[PDB]
A paper describes a structure:
Noroviruses are highly contagious, infecting both humans and animals. The principal structural difference was a variable length P2 subdomain loop (Loop A), which was located near the HBGA pocket.
The five P domains were structurally equivalent with a root mean square deviation for C-alpha atoms ranging between 0.586 Å (GII.23-GII.27) and 1.645 Å (GII.9-GX). Also, these residue side chains were properly positioned to bind the fucose moiety of HBGAs (structure not shown). These two equivalent residues were lacking in the GVIII and GX P domains; however, an aspartic acid (D367) was located nearby in the GX P domain. The cross-reactivity of the P domains was determined using direct ELISA with a broad-spectrum human norovirus Nanobody (Fc-NB26) that binds to a highly conserved region on the P domain. The GVIII P domain also had many Fc-NB26-binding residues, while most Fc-NB26-binding residues were absent in GX. Subsequently, the bat norovirus could be considered antigenically distinct from human GII noroviruses. In addition, the bat norovirus HBGA-binding site may be shifted from the regular GII HBGA pocket, as observed in other genogroups.
Residue numbers in the entry:
A (entry chain A), B (entry chain B): 226 to 522
Write the structure that this text describes.
């Protein structure tokens, strides 16, 4: 089938790195380092990359089994994948599908099992966020159960986040500074030098906002585009899909952009951080080579 | 475009009444009263009913403005709709789009504003769950702010839920002991007497499970099907779409069912509550009239 994108406005779509509606659309050419996001990554031909979950709703969800009974507000889980199979550290994955792919001081959560007295809240402290090792230690856990051997499923709800730039810093998934053995999706770098990554932004709930209160986490593809690629049998006939971003109510063509086949969008001619209207729709035009030069925004 | 459904397995899709992956698929013929869900409602031609949000990720999200500074762990919010427009409580809508459409003792939440000391947790007690009035009183609010006139955005994360049957009991949205002035989408009723509603189930996190720990909330359509109908220009050439539910790996056809044009699925010949495998895909077969009688499961 010929390539297309869903006829949804940006503000009708969802982040693929934090479950929430998209709220901003912007290009920032002065970010310190290129992002290496592990969620929200998919090729145009429908190949998921990194820890990107195939089920949209497994983003920020987790499943596991308690390794010991709760004591001293500590719950340790051996981690499973969304399919219920055991997560195998030896596979090279940094974490089960859908796990957070950025640095934070705390990851706040809620969880429950299928038996009584297992609904609780807690958090994973940064030093304990080492899912590549096969488990996570949940602290400040406020339920009396579970006992050992009980399946738990939960949701990461918010983060302790003192510094917004840490959304673009991968966590120490294996508890060390050395990620060489991990099978990580590659950094996102525009192919032409004047191009700037187009960021789809949303607002997560965070604590530790005393220094500066604005929190924005970006992703490369709206979740609805990822699902679109999974539900169509597209062939990437060129290096990039040339798209137009159009306000369908007002007719105004806002800009053209390139959706590279590895799954990210760029615009040209951005010299300072630039925000774009949210009520537009992205429409496919044609396939273009990597060095196709876009009209500046 | 000819009618189709996305090629996702049931366990690869999401509930449209609680944000979480689908976990069960079942038909219960012994539910005495038909459900009147206000979320997860969409015709095959892509027209939303009830409070069903156009953006998948606005389910269980809310936004508004504080009417007073926080005091005594109470935060009162005047509600907005998802698009930031003011929710007019005189209009007859039961709630802003995406608000929970069932009865619970407490609706647990988290929220935050643009300024520091506004990230908190709290809850809406059942007696305060009257969003049709244009606002909600949040209690057990644990942040020191916001002051008055401050925008807040938040998420419903879990419920206090004594009885699973209350997932199918609409709440008293206007606090008037159900007076019938509200604009509600109609009950979901199979058009033939031998048919049973096919329920797409997920597990929300709930408290008050000490006595019966299993909690399952059902919906009429996976969220991904609703988005599919919004992103295609379908014309229902019949009263109902005949579907086959097939395990694509083994090729095993499990049952046939009818997807009625108003947006729900039924099976035939179910005499006891019956669960079905989650690894199947619903495939469109043809259009059939309302009187078409399905092969029994």
């Amino acid at each position: 089938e010929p390539f297309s994108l869903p006829n949804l406005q940006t503000d009708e779509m969802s982040s693929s790195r934090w479950p929430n509606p998209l709220a901003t659309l912007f290009a920032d050419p002065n970010v310190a380092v290129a992002p290496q996001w592990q969620n929200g990554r998919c090729t145009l031909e429908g190949e998921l990359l990194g820890t990107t979950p195939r089920n949209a709703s497994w983003l920020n969800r987790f499943r596991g089994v308690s390794t010991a009974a709760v004591a001293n507000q500590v719950l340790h889980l051996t981690l499973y994948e969304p399919d219920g199979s055991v997560f195998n550290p030896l596979s090279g994955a940094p974490a089960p599908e859908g796990f957070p792919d950025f640095t934070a001081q705390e990851y706040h959560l809620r969880a429950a099992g299928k038996v009584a007295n297992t609904t609780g809240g807690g958090e994973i402290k940064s030093t304990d966020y080492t899912p590549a090792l096969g488990g996570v230690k949940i602290t400040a856990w406020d339920a009396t159960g579970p006992s050992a051997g009980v399946e738990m499923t939960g949701q990461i709800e918010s983060i302790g986040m003192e510094n917004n730039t840490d959304f673009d810093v991968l966590p120490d998934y294996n508890g060390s500074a050395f990620d060489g053995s991990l099978n990580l999706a590659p950094p996102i770098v525009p192919l032409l030098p004047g191009e700037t990554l187009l960021r789809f932004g949303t607002v997560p709930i965070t604590t530790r906002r005393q220094s500066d209160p604005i929190r924005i986490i970006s992703c490369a593809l709206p979740q609805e585009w990822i699902t679109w690629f999974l539900t169509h049998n597209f062939t990437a006939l060129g290096d990039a899909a040339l798209l137009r971003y159009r306000n369908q109510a007002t007719g105004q063509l806002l800009f053209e952009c390139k959706l590279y086949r590895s799954g990210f969008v760029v615009v040209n001619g951005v010299n300072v951080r630039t925000e774009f209207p949210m009520s537009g729709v992205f429409e496919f035009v044609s396939w273009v080579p990597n060095f196709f030069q876009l009209a500046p925004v």
